[PDB]
Every structure is written in C-alpha cells, then in structure tokens.
Structure 1
Amino acid sequence: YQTERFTKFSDTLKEFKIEQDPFNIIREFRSAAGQLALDLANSGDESNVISSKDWELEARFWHLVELLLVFRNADLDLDEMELHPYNSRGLFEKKLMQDNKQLYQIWIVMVWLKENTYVMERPKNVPTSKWLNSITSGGLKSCDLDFPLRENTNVLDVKDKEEDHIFFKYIYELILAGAIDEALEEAKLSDNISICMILCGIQEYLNPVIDTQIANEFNTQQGIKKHSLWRRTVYSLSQQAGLDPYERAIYSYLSGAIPNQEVLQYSDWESDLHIHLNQILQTEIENYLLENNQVGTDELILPLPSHALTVQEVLNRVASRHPSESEHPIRVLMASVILDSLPSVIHSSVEMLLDIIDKPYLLRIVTHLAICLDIINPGSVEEVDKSKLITTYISLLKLQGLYENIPIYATFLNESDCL
C-alpha cells in the first residue's frame, strides 16, 4: 500500500482549506512523515532502511519548522522585565532569554537537537555501591572521587574503572539528550552522590523572595550564587586527565566547552552542532552577566573564551567537519530554516529545475513547505516559485496516477484554470 504517502500530505491540506492554526498543517506533516518512517523501518528490504531514515529526517525537519515558525510568527509581544542590581543572576539570565530573540532561537534549536538524540539503554547489573572492588581489595585510604587523583590512578581496580566508564558514558548520553532529571536520578541511585551534586551546579541562583517576578515558579531559593566560579571549577576539572573521557566530556559540556577528542570524534552533525550552539549560548550568557556587573571579580579564576560564534559560522564549521551529512538535502533545509534563509533556498531548488529530480522526497517537501509558508506568511514565497513547484509536483501526481487529489493543490493560482 505504502505508495499512499502523497494522500496523507494531500489529506492534511484538504482538512485545512475546508474548516474555513495553519501550524497544524506542518504538525501533521511531521506526524505523517514519522508514521511513514515507522512503516519502511519495521519489516523491510534493506533498501528500505535508507528511505526510512530519509523519512525520520523528513519528520525532524517538519518539527524544527514548527518550533521555529511558531516562535517567530506567533510572536505577539509581551511585557518587558525590569530588573534591579540587587536581583539574582537567575533573573538576568531569564531577562536575556526574553529580550534577545536571536539567542532564544538558539535555545529552541538546541531543544530540538536534544529531542532527537539517541540514548543507550539503562545499564543493567549495576553494582550495589561505588568503587566496591577497590575497597574490597583494600587500598582506598579515602573513599572520595578525588583520592586516585591525589596520587596515582593505580589505586583504582580495573573493573571499577570499567564501571565508572559505563556510568559516565550513560550520564553523558543522557545530558546530550536533555535528560537532566534522569541523570540526577541515575547519579543518586547508582551511589554517585558527588557527581549528582556536580550536576546540581547547573542552575543559576534565584530567590523567590528577592527575585519577586518568579515567586510563582519557586517557593524556595535555589541554584548556586558563585556560578562563574562553579563554571571555571568544572572546566578545570574537565581538563584534568586521569579522569574517564566521558566524565571529562560531561564537564566540558557543563562549562560551555568542547569535549575532548576521544569523545568528540564520535559526534555527528547533530551532536557536534549541538555542542557548539551550547558553547555560543554559554558564552553569550556569561557576557550578558559581565556587561551588567553581576559577576564578581574573585570568581574569574581562569580564562574561558569570551567571543561567541554566530550561528552562521558554527553551521559553516560543523558543515566542513561533516561534509557528507551536511550536504544531505533535507539537512540543508534544516540549516536553511535555522538561518531563516528559507524562501532563499526554495527559489534556489526551484532553479535546480531549469540532481533534485533524482531524490523523491525533495520535490514534494519543498512544495508542501512553500504552501505552508505562504499560508502562514502570505507573500513568503514568490508567486512564480509556487507556480513552478506545484506544476512539477502535480505532473508527478499524474505519473503516479493520483489525479483524484489534484484540485486541492490547484487552490493557489488562477493558473489552475489550465487544468
């Protein structure tokens, strides 16, 4: 049956033109692609695993589109936040994310990135308690994480290191996926209290009593006041070798830094891009705080880089670092959406019809995207480009023998007359 696909997308358009909000179209496009992603994936010829991934990718694209256009377009402007110098850093961070839409967009994108991150299954047969092997062998004169750092790592049993590896890797995957609550649960429950505690430093300080404008979200002070310190402390910890590469990786991510080579070598376009947007973000916040004298000089223990990249440049670098992946045609759209250069790319792939015909999803996707765009933002895509796109896709509806559902797509030109 699967050669139903176009129906689903077409179907969604029917429903829209007929209850005469348009963001639902895309939401459905997403779900549609996802549903199809499942079909080709389950039981299939290994020629299908490929086009299955091109559907999952499809789906992620629709999601990213929804998120960003919702934020950008459903922008109806709220009330400005008036801080005082007595206010906590927490509030200033919030203000920053409110006022600077360019940067919040980075947040949105990171959220999307996390959403679609793979995490291993929870490690089984985890041991009763930490470093149990070393303790049992005798030779841990101190039971604290820093003991084998104070003096040769030869202290820790091999099996203990192997388990610490399992743990820190799992925690790392969870952190990259946004699963911070799960990471704290794992830390707690796996007898890694001190690491847990480390994960608690992630929050900026708020006090509901002082920072009135969040006395709703909070009933109790929380987060840590000397955060610039925390951050250097963690970063330095991240640079100290004789720690497991995933643990160092974790601290890197937390300090707004770029994890060690041993770990980073396995990160893909999404993972890598995520890492570097995290860096942009971290740097930008800490700079925002410095420009408002909410950082205390004592805490500038160490040099961290102060110069934030632009999303443009991060993308360019990550691209050159992952050319194969970068060049994939829906991930180009992903980037195009991220930079807003989107009608830009529409008109572009339009002129590539004048090695876009070779891949099937593309001509469809661009067309339905163009439709959505001009629905949500009348004017968005050049009238001509709509004409050209629908023209060509329609002729494929003909080549597929689905003339049945051509009128729906017609509802965008007087050129429709000619059908």
Structure 2
Amino acid sequence: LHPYNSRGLFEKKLMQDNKQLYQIWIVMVWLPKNVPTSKWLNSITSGGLKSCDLDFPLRENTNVLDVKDKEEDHIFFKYIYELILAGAIDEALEEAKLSDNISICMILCGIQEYLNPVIDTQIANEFNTQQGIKKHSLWRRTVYSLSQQAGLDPYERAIYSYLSGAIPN
C-alpha cells in the first residue's frame, strides 16, 4: 500500500481514507446502432486529403472527410452523455468505437491511471501488464484544452469537459 506507488495507489488511498468524497463519486455515477467503419476514400478524390487521420478535420474544416460520420460525432456522442451518468467510461468506449472513430477512442483509454506490476503492488496481481497513462495529469490538462476548443462544436467536447471535471457546457 504505503511505501512507493504510481498514481494508481494514491487514488485508492484517497477514497479509502475519506468516505464523504467516496460517496460524492457514487452519486454522480448513479442515474444499439450498426456502423460499418472506414473513411478516407471519398476525401482525396474531390480535393485534398493528403494524410489520413481525423486530425485533418482539425487542421481545417470538419467537412473534409465523409459527412455521414460528421453525423455520428453529434449523435452517438449524445448517447454517450446519457451513458456517463449511468456510470463508467469503458461503456462509452464501446460506443465511441461504433462511432467510426478509432483514434479519438484512444482518449477514453487515456482516462486510465497507471496500473502496473512495476509500480503498484496490490494492482500487480489483477494485472500482469501495463495499463493506463503515467503522464495522466498532462493528459488531464490537455483534454481540458479541448473542453474550451472553439473548433470543437459542443457535441464532441462536452465529454472532454467531464474527463477532466465538468464545466457545464
């Protein structure tokens, strides 16, 4: 427990050694589509595309790829906002993955703190491999820049508010 830890055992001890914060966490947490995936065909042909990624969307217009998955960044994110107060984020991961996103779904694996048999000793036994981010605080302040990003329309970011603690957007 004690002697030297990652960030994973800190968070456990926090919740251990108070019980009004632990209840506060439990309150907020307590209260289907078929998508074939793929992109990047139709984009190069009309104009430019030039590099494949949903970071092309962020260098300029968000009309540059297929626009029936521009649909999905509104709509399946709306499903995700019902989900996060029904609890979890790995639930929301499984729906992000049907949203035709597959590198913007890495942000929901980002929310994990470092759980490791190299730096935890009671989380070294329900895992035998590295999990999460050990730069989880630079992750938190960088997913918080998106909560204010003004290129990001509100139907993406409102969960990026919430991933770093929720401004009411």
> Cα gap change, 1:239/1:219 in structure 2, threshold over 3 Å: closer, same or farther?
same
Higher RCO (CA < 8 A, seq sep 6+) = 2
1:235 to 1:199, Cα distance in 2 relative to 1, 3 A: same
Does the C-alpha gap of structure 1 residues 207 and 124 become closer, same or farther in structure 2, counting only changes over 3 Å? closer
Q: CA deviation at 1:173?
A: 2.9
The change in CA–CA distance for 1:164 and 1:138 in structure 2 (over 3 A counts) is: farther
CA contact (8 A) 2:113 2:134 kept: yes
Q: Is the 8 A contact 1:133 1:160 kept in 2?
A: no
Alpha carbons 2:115, 2:131 under 8 Å: kept: yes
Out of 136, 154, 162, the position equivalent to 2:63 is 154
CA RMSD of aligned residues (A): 2.6
Cα distance in 1, alignment partners of residues 157 and 80 from structure 2: 12
Q: Indicate the residue corresponding to 1:109 in structure 2.
A: 27
Q: CA deviation at 1:249?
A: 0.5
Partners in 2 of 1:158 and 1:248 — Cα distance?
Answer: 19
> The residue matched to 2:122 in structure 1 has which SS?
helix
Q: CA–CA distance in 1 between the matches of 2:30 and 2:34?
A: 32
1:194-249 C-alpha deviation (Å, 9 max, x unpaired): 12211001111122343112333322221110111000110102211222322110
CA deviation string 1:18-71 (max 9, x = no partner): xxxxxxxxxxxxxxxxxxxxxxxxxxxxxxxxxxxxxxxxxxxxxxxxxxxxxx
- For structure 1, the 5+ residue unaligned runs are 1-82, 114-122, 260-419
Deviation at 1:155, TM superposition (A): 3.0
Cα distance per residue 1:243-296 (max 9 Å; x no partner): 23221101011011314xxxxxxxxxxxxxxxxxxxxxxxxxxxxxxxxxxxxx
SS of structure 2 residue aligned to 1:250: helix
Structure 2 segments unaligned to the other structure (5+ residues): none
Equivalent residue, structure 2, for 1:367: none
Question: Judging changes above 3 Å, is the alpha-carbon distance between structure 1 residues 171 and 209 closer, same or farther for their aligned structure 2 residues?
Answer: same
Output the CA distance in 2 between the equivalents of 1:91 and 1:232. Answer: 21
Shift of 1:136: 5.6
The alignment partner of 1:205 has SS state of coil
- The CA deviation string for residues 327-376 of structure 1, in whole angstroms up to 9 with x for no partner, is xxxxxxxxxxxxxxxxxxxxxxxxxxxxxxxxxxxxxxxxxxxxxxxxxx
Q: Which is greater in Rg?
A: 1
TM-score by length of 1: 0.36
Q: Does the residue aligned with 1:160 lie in a helix, a strand or coil?
A: coil
Q: Return the alpha-carbon distance in structure 1 between the equivalents of residues 46 and 146 of structure 2.
A: 27
CA distance in 2, matches of 1:170, 1:91: 32
* TM-score under structure 2 length normalisation: 0.82
C-alpha distance 237-160 of structure 1, shift in aligned 2 (>3 A):
same
Structure 2 vs 1, CA of residues 105 and 202 (structure 1 numbering), >3 Å: closer, same or farther? Answer: same
CA contact (8 A) 1:205 1:224 kept: yes
Deviation at 1:111, TM superposition (A): 3.3
